[PDB]
Structure 1
Amino acid sequence: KVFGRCELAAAMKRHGLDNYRGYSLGNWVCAAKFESNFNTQATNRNTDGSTDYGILQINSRWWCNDGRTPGSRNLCNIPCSALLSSDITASVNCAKKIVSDGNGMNAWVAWRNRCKGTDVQAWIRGCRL
């Protein structure tokens, strides 16, 4: 599923991401924009053999199981394919664990490089929330 901007903002808000660990909603929308272009089916391989999955490009090295990332963890206790669902619940629940881990949203490279320090509120402008 390719979410619309405000549709995703609403879903993220309902699932408790607005201000989660101090990250306003626009941060999460901005992250999703640059990680996946709001496409729940997005996947991308990493040089280390791990793969990033879904709307927030969660990585198999640590967070989910894909059966093909030797030596990896599955900290979210889910198959990576669950992160490609039209329903973002699994991705959000896993993101909450990630962002609570020490480095906050810096875990998302696209967030640090394209969202951090910018006017992230623009990503939710116009949405009925």
Structure 2
Amino acid sequence: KVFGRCELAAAMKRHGLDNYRGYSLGNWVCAAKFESNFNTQATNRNTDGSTDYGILQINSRWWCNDGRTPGSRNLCNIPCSALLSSDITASVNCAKKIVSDGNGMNAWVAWRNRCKGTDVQAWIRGCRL
């Protein structure tokens, strides 16, 4: 599924992402835009064997198990395929764990280069929340 900026902003808010660990809603919407362009089906192959799955491009080397990544750690205890679902519940719960257990939202280079320190309010403006 491809979400519209506002449709996604509302879903994430219902899932407790607004100001989760200090990151206002816009950061999460802005991340998703540049990571997957709001497509829950996005998959990206990397040089080390792993793949990024879903709306927040979560990696198979550390977070989920796709049965084809060497040294997989599966820290979210989830088959990577659950992250390709239309229901963003699984991608969110794992994203909350990656953001808790580490470097904040630095796990996402697109967020670091395109969202950090910008007016992230632009991502939720015009939306009915």
Q: Which residue of 2 aligns with 1:72?
A: 72
Deviation at 1:20, TM superposition (A): 0.3
C-alpha distance in 2 between matches for 1:40 and 1:54: 5
Q: Which residue of 2 aligns with 1:58?
A: 58
Give the aligned CA root-mean-square deviation in angstroms.
0.6
TM-score of the aligned structures, taking structure 2 as reference length: 0.98
C-alpha distance in 1 between matches for 2:114 and 2:61: 23
Q: Which residue of 2 aligns with 1:109?
A: 109
TM-score of the aligned structures, taking structure 1 as reference length: 0.98
User: Is there any run of 5+ residues in structure 1 with no aligned partner, and where?
Assistant: none
Deviation at 1:111, TM superposition (A): 0.5
Deviation per CA, 1:19-77: give whole Å up to 9, x if none. Answer: 00010000000000000000000000111110000000000011000011111110111
Deviation at 1:102, TM superposition (A): 2.1
Deviation at 1:101, TM superposition (A): 1.5
SS of 1:71 mapped into structure 2: coil
C-alpha distance in 1 between matches for 2:109 and 2:49: 17
Aligned length: 129
C-alpha distance in 2 between matches for 1:47 and 1:95: 22
Deviation per CA, 1:74-122: give whole Å up to 9, x if none. Answer: 0111100100000000000000000012200000111001111111110
SS of 1:105 mapped into structure 2: helix
SS of 1:10 mapped into structure 2: helix
SS of 1:44 mapped into structure 2: strand
C-alpha distance in 2 between matches for 1:83 and 1:66: 11
C-alpha distance in 2 between matches for 1:4 and 1:66: 28
C-alpha distance in 2 between matches for 1:75 and 1:121: 32
C-alpha distance in 1 between matches for 2:86 and 2:2: 8
